[PDB]
């Protein structure tokens, strides 16, 4: 699991004042290795699938009661006219 | 000053993974034309548009009740 690397050390000594060809170090943290913990992702159960199904049955769950709600009135209009006629007619009979 | 050893950074410096057999048949990296993901936010999507629709036609058909007793009324003191 060790990277390729020819090269094992060098050495030529660090000036503060001389730094040239300005290259950039791998910056590193200070604590040990062990609790750089491993990579998880976990997924939900509730898959792209199963909220199809689930909202899926709450439509079909809610159309059930617009229709409900339609029949409730959809019988107004039969109403009026089951009950305004024979009044007109009884207004008629003066 | 200061001291610290050194590793150079040459190209030649490779990287050896190691890859599962089974790693590249993974239900994400294969994917297909449509998921049920966005059916998902589709139809969340017009579930709430009809539940705002359930308050303006609320609102609406509230006065069904209030249309009916001013042409009642006014006929009825005429009657009496």
């Known amino acids: 699991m060790d990277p390729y690397c020819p090269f094992d050390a060098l050495d030529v000594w660090e000036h503060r004042r001389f730094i040239v060809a300005?290259?950039?170090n791998f910056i590193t943290p200070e604590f040990p290795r062990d609790f750089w913990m491993s990579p998880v992702f976990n997924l939900p159960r509730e898959t792209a699938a199963e909220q199809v199904v689930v909202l899926q049955?709450?439509?079909?769950?809610?159309?059930?009661a617009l229709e409900n709600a339609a029949m409730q009135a959809a019988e107004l209009p039969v109403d009026i006219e089951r009950r305004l006629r024979p009044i007109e007619r009884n207004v008629h009979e003066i």
């Open 22 to 24: 300005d290259s950039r």
């Open 57 to 64: 049955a709450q439509r079909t769950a809610a159309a059930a």
